[PDB]
Amino acid sequence: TSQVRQNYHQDSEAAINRQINLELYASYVYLSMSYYFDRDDVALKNFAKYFHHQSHEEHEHAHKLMKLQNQRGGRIFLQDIQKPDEDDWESGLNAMEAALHLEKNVNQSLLELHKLATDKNDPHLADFIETHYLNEQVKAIKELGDHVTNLRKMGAPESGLAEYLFDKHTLG
Amino acid sequence: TSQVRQNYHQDSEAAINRQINLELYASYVYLSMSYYFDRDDVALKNFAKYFHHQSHEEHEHAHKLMKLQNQRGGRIFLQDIQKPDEDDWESGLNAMEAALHLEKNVNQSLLELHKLATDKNDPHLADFIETHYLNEQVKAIKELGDHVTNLRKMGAPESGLAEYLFDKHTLG
Amino acid sequence: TSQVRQNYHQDSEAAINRQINLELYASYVYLSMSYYFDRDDVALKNFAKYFHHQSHEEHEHAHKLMKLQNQRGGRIFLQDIQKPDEDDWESGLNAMEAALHLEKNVNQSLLELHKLATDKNDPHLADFIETHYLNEQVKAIKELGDHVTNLRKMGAPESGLAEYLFDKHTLG
Amino acid sequence: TSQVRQNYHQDSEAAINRQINLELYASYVYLSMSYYFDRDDVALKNFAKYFHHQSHEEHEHAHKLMKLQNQRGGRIFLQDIQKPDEDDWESGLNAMEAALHLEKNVNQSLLELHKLATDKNDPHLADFIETHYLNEQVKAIKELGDHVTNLRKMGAPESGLAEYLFDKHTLG
Amino acid sequence: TSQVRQNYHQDSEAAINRQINLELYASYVYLSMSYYFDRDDVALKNFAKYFHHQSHEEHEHAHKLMKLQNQRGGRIFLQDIQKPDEDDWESGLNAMEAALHLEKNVNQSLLELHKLATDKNDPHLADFIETHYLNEQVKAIKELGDHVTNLRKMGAPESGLAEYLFDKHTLG
Amino acid sequence: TSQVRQNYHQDSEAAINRQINLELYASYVYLSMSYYFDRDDVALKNFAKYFHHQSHEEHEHAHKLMKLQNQRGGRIFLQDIQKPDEDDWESGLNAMEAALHLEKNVNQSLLELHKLATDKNDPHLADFIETHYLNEQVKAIKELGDHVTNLRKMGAPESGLAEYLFDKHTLG
């Protein structure tokens, strides 16, 4: 047992390791999306930039969790970062919809993690999740929702003009 | 034989003279395109600006080759710069497609030149082509590809609105 | 076939996809190492900083390859990023030795990729590997070699004092 | 007929197209001269710089005419840019003499163009030629005359010392 | 075998040691030339400055090769730096001609080294030679060629006035 | 006999030529030492920097002597720069000890040169040696002595830790 370990349940330690992997997975999904929009037959550079930014945001999310694991005296056990479910993301709208779904999945995991922290009477871990993750999730979900709505109302994905104009006026 | 000449095959010297002409030809094509978009019945000033820039880029490509010829002790023999295949470039999309085709043709010539340099064991010439030309070609081809894709997806060439908006939002 | 694709063999495209994965793997190994030195029972913060820097360097290596894939009209196919071979990296010296081994493995892959590019007469790809990868590898390998030597001569890994002083005087 | 076309004779339109070609030809002659002085067995870098400058001056002359063609609702029809009459320009003095001859030929063409504009009662075209071309010609001819005189009086082309000193003291 | 050594043939290592010596020799030749022009009975201080600069350029060439040897895990074995073939360099023109000959000899050695690297499938070494040496050679050879031409055309070496004026107007 | 020559004995001229060679030799020894510490299996970069600095100091020593030779109307006759006595310098301490020995040898030569100048009643040469060389020698010898002492007292060469710490705290 670590010299720093105090009030840190083995279940919480395991849950943190799982969340680390999920954040790294989310980062990979966004990296995949970024380079899809970099394709010569897609060519939406601000979509590419947007998802690249999201990829690095997820990387920071993974960082804070790995730091937390060591702070609490838990031990980091990394797992494979699974390849994303798609190679071809179809369109700007589809990518935004897939991102929205991803963020709701990540949020669900974090809410489960918060419940576990509460159940194990770990207020430090509970507050860590609240302070650094829960509102970040809500903000991300709202933003992606907003983006999906605009694209749909503009005529995407059928209208290539819509996706082009959104790339220029919202993501640029 | 020039006092500076060393490891420079007569075939390479001839190939360099041909490439000089091709770069000057490419510059002329782009100049032609530039002024097509300057026409009162076309009036796409950022298309005009874009192709004008490309024309001067090609001029620099010709410069470096003429400099190389003299550096290696070869002798510059200029030929006619042939007029472009078209006087009327039809549309923004058609011009971009024609430019893409042109750049792939120029690239093919450079790849043949590189093969010749390799065959004649001329690593200086081989590296000159690699350093200053091959990636410039790849970058140009990718950019033009990106532009063609956007214009097509936006509804060009039938949509004059598409070409107008692309002129303003991508080339401006 | 992509509109931009020219002189780009399917074998090269596949090799590029494999290299993308290897660079992402290297980034993951370094991230793992970084947080090992962040442990309360290891506590070498400049080792942690050093490997974190290397992790982001590898991330950039992956970026340039993904960009290259799209530049040439190839298609990015991502695979799982495998977890590193170790969870516990033992010591500063062992981590440096493992990094050295990793870099020689990455270098071997790149040399094989260069040979393939040469065999397929793809001088653009050959020069891409030379310009952006081969010397970066040689520099990384030399640096890690230097670090291993210092640590060994100082008395690592048995001497915790040696690893502490190296952390402060070389990596700080 | 162009929506902008007014008082613009078809003969004038044709004459403008011919002048565009002549200006591009002059630019090519000067480019050829520039690189002749860049040869290792000539090596007069300020002669090279001087003619390069003249080449770009001619390029601007062609620009203004192409702009004029579109301004008036005429249509640009480009022709081959003929290679210069010489590959080897012999000496600094000979190049200056050839340039002088070229400029008098270009001037003759412009004076004929002005006469045509007057004959067709096109005062806009007449003034365009006067404002942007006629005095530019007179200035160029005088300058080249001055240069020829100096070189001759100094002992060129027999004196390589004369051409060297002129390169340094007048063109540098 | 060095811990860093990878894909580095013993023949290449030996060739690098030979090239190190040749670069140091070239530096010595230029140092000798520099001080010849410093003599009271020669007194061409800009010739002296020019060759001194070249001497330090060669010193840097030797540096990069010694660095390369260690980078690749080869071992530096230095040899005698042979005294130059002349003590008295006769004239500015003769020194420039001797320098031209020297640079073509150094270039020949580097081209042989490049061929060896290619034959041993060492693309890192091949690119090292291309990037840092081959064009530097071509540039040096062209410059010296230019200088020889000017001096000859001005009347050197018989004309002491020619050498004096060249010292002042080209090398100053 | 040079027009500038006055009170300059042929023996002094010869002695100066010998000293020029010795200073160049010293520069070569230090260059050799510098790159020994650049080896991946030595890796003491501040030792490398220190000896590199000393190498360029010796180069300046050679410069002043070559200048002196010409100032006095003597004639520079260069000889081979002999390779150093060692390829492998063993350790930081051994290199410092070898440098100390070298500097005492150079000093002995200069003291002999001073005696010759005195014997030939050449006060200019005597003062040249005093002003620019004798105290520089004493300073170099003292510094190297100081360095040897520190390394010995710290536990070098057996202690790799000692050499590492000296590299960081004295030479850095």
Ligand SMILES: [Ca+2]
């Ligand atoms: Ca999987």
Ligand SMILES: [Ca+2]
């Ligand atoms: Ca034709």
Ligand SMILES: [Ca+2]
């Ligand atoms: Ca696995």
Ligand SMILES: [Ca+2]
């Ligand atoms: Ca013709």
Ligand SMILES: [Ca+2]
């Ligand atoms: Ca008027």
Ligand SMILES: [Ca+2]
């Ligand atoms: Ca007027």
Ligand SMILES: [Ca+2]
């Ligand atoms: Ca000898």
Ligand SMILES: [Ca+2]
């Ligand atoms: Ca290359």
Ligand SMILES: [Ca+2]
């Ligand atoms: Ca290269």
Ligand SMILES: [Ca+2]
């Ligand atoms: Ca010897």
Ligand SMILES: [Cu+2]
């Ligand atoms: Cu990134």
Ligand SMILES: [Cu+2]
């Ligand atoms: Cu996240």
Ligand SMILES: [Cu+2]
């Ligand atoms: Cu997220």
Ligand SMILES: [Cu+2]
């Ligand atoms: Cu222009």
Ligand SMILES: [Cu+2]
């Ligand atoms: Cu080009």
Ligand SMILES: [Cu+2]
């Ligand atoms: Cu191009």
